[PDB]
């Protein structure tokens, strides 16, 4: 087996092992609604074994950056259906990444100019982009215990909206220091209720969110993404091996589509070595594993052949190469990604990277 082998993901038949990683492109229109241009972008990439669409806020409070799309309104459902229809017409498969940014936001992006919510009242460091340029972060409000059901319900409604939008499945974003990750990691979570302290408490929001989403979706169409060794957004855990190893085992109850690991590119250089080898998680999580982070044809074939992972997601290379699968398959030159046009804007650096 290699990166071009087919794969059975529940009832979905993937033509290859190549996944398009979720990539925020900040190109939503008024009301954070997807539009035709976005449909073209994802349709261009439909040769992917599976596309995971960009992080998409499940509720207004879950937005943290200008012009990211939502999945909380009927108008957003309609705009996403343009996208899933195009991907389906092009013979592809697409899951929606369900987001809530938690503390990584600013009042200017929040309903009524209120505070971002979080497990604990810990201000991120530095500045955050608003509609009026960069502004200092404020301190988020720590959620009351009694409010956690409402967070879980916002994710359940986000998942239901994704189903109405015609996606093939959803991915729970539990990585990169956003809301669920903020609860996971003891650096961001110092709660003294059942959602803080012990690992089974820190993992509780993830597990409750997953349980609610599997009430809407068949479980084999629900994935979870973790990023055990990122330090993005000021979110770190003091015992990542035990924390993430626990989560990989706890998720098995749900019979999920997959577990997706973003392997931080800078982890070894920082952490002075390999704190959480992905093999540790591979051995604990009994389902499909997607791995991600600086993969190539050569690196992806190896992890598949070695049984270290089942699926390989590419982020950066999918920005710049719409036909990435084909290019990898024939060892074609790859287009170089232009960082200047990753976030915001229009067609330039989005739909105008050429096919082979
Ligand atoms: C422009 C850009 C936007 C990203 N947006 C997301 C996101 O929406 N959700 C997410 O989980 N990761 C996101 N990431 C992380 C990527 O999915 C991916 O894990 C990372 O870029 C490493 O993979 P790569 O080396 O193949 O690019 C983003 C990365 C980039 C470069
Ligand atoms: C939503 C998301 O995960 C994003 C990832 C990053 C990244 C990998 O560096 C980040 C956490 O800042 C880039 C863009 C966003 C939104
Ligand atoms: Cl196509
Ligand atoms: Na199914």
Domains along the sequence of the chain with CATH:
7-341 (3.20.20.70)
**According to the annotation, is 24 in a ligand binding site?**
yes
**According to the annotation, is 130 in a ligand binding site?**
no
CA nearest ligand 2 atom 3, residue: 176
Q: Method of determination?
A: X-ray
What is the rounded end-to-end Cα distance, in angstroms, of the chain?
A: 25
Ligand nearest to the CA of 11: 4
Q: What are phi and psi of 245, to 5 degrees?
A: -65, -40
State the Cα–Cα distance between residues 162 and 174, nearest whole angstrom.
17
197-205: long-range contacts (C-beta < 8 A, 24 or more apart)?
199/242, 199/243, 199/246, 200/246, 200/250, 202/243, 203/246, 203/247, 203/250, 205/119, 205/148, 205/151, 205/152, 205/179, 205/180
Show Cβ contacts of residue 192 under 8 Å, excluding neighbours closer than 6 positions: none
Q: Taking Cα atoms as reference points, which of 228, 265, 221, 230 lies closest to residue 247?
A: 228
Residue 127, beta-bridge partner list = 136
Bin 10: left if φ > 0, else alpha if -120 < ψ < 50, else beta: left
CA nearest ligand 2 atom 5, residue: 176
State the Cα–Cα distance between residues 253 and 281, nearest whole angstrom.
15
| Torsion angle, alpha carbons of 8, 13, 18, 22, to 10 | -100
CA nearest ligand 2 atom 16, residue: 24
- CB-CB contact of 123 with 100 (8 Å): no
Show Cβ contacts of residue 19 under 8 Å, excluding neighbours closer than 6 positions: 48, 49, 50, 51, 52, 290, 292, 311, 312, 313, 314
Quickly list H helices, the chain.
Answer: 36-44, 74-89, 148-164, 179-184, 199-202, 204-213, 240-250, 267-271, 278-284, 297-305, 316-320, 324-330
Q: What are phi and psi of 273, to 5 degrees?
A: 135, -170
Residue 313, beta-bridge partner list = 19, 292
User: Tokens for 345?
Assistant: 């804007």
Catalytic residue chosen out of the listed positions 178, 195, 295, 350:
178
CA distances from 7 to 18, 50, 96, 256, 287 (A): 10, 10, 19, 15, 13
Assess whether 295 carries a catalytic annotation.
Answer: no
**According to the annotation, is 211 in a ligand binding site?**
no
Ligand nearest to the CA of 54: 1
Mutating to test ligand 2, I would choose from 137, 232, 339 the residue with most ligand atoms within 8 A of its C-beta, which is 232
State the Cα–Cα distance between residues 123 and 28, nearest whole angstrom.
27
- CB-CB contact of 293 with 232 (8 Å): no
Q: Taking Cα atoms as reference points, which of 188, 186, 20, 158 lies closest to residue 77?
A: 158
State the Cα–Cα distance between residues 347 and 38, nearest whole angstrom.
9
User: Tokens for 255?
Assistant: 């019979």
**According to the annotation, is 53 in a ligand binding site?**
no
CA nearest ligand 1 atom 1, residue: 342
Mutating to test ligand 1, I would choose from 3, 19, 24 the residue with most ligand atoms within 8 A of its C-beta, which is 24
Residue appearing with tokens 């539009």: 35
DSSP of 92-133, one letter per residue? --EEEEEE--TTSS-GGGSGGG---EESS--PPSSEEEETTE
Distance 192 CA to ligand 3 centre (A): 50
């Amino acid at each position: 087996i290699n990166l071009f082998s087919s794969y059975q993901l529940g009832e979905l038949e993937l033509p290859n092992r190549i996944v398009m990683a979720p990539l925020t492109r900040s190109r939503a229109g008024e009301g954070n609604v997807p539009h035709q241009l976005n449909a073209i972008y994802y349709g261009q990439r439909a040769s992917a074994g599976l596309i995971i669409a960009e992080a998409t806020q499940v509720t207004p409070q879950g937005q943290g950056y200008p012009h990211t799309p939502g999945i909380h309104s009927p108008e957003q459902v309609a705009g996403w259906k343009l996208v899933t229809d195009t991907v389906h017409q092009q013979g592809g498969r697409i899951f929606l990444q369900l987001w809530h940014v938690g503390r990584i936001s600013h009042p200017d992006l929040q309903p009524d100019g209120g505070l971002p919510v979080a497990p604990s009242a810990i201000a991120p460091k530095g500045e955050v982009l608003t509609y009026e340029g960069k502004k200092p972060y404020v301190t988020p409000r720590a959620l009351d215990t009694s409010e956690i059901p409402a967070i879980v319900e916002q994710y359940r409604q986000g998942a239901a909206n994704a189903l109405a939008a015609g996606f093939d499945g959803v991915e729970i974003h539990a990585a990169n220091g956003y809301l669920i990750d903020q609860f996971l990691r003891d650096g961001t979570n110092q709660r003294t209720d059942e959602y803080g302290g012990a690992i089974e408490n820190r993992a509780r929001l993830l597990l409750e969110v997953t349980e609610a989403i599997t009430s809407v979706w068949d479980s084999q169409r629900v994935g979870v993404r973790l990023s055990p060794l990122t330090t993005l957004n000021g979110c770190v855990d003091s015992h990542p091996l035990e924390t993430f190893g626990y989560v990989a085992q706890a998720l098995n109850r749900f019979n999920l589509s997959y577990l997706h690991i973003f392997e931080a590119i800078d982890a070894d250089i920082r952490h002075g070595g390999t704190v959480v080898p992905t093999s540790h998680l591979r051995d604990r999580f009994t389902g499909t594993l997607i791995v991600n982070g600086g993969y190539t044809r050569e690196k992806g074939d190896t992890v598949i052949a070695n049984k270290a992972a089942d699926l390989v997601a590419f982020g950066t290379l999918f920005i710049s190469n719409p036909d990435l699968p084909e290019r990898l398959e024939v060892n074609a030159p790859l287009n170089q990604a232009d960082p200047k046009t990753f976030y915001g804007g229009g067609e330039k650096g989005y739909t105008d990277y050429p096919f082979l």
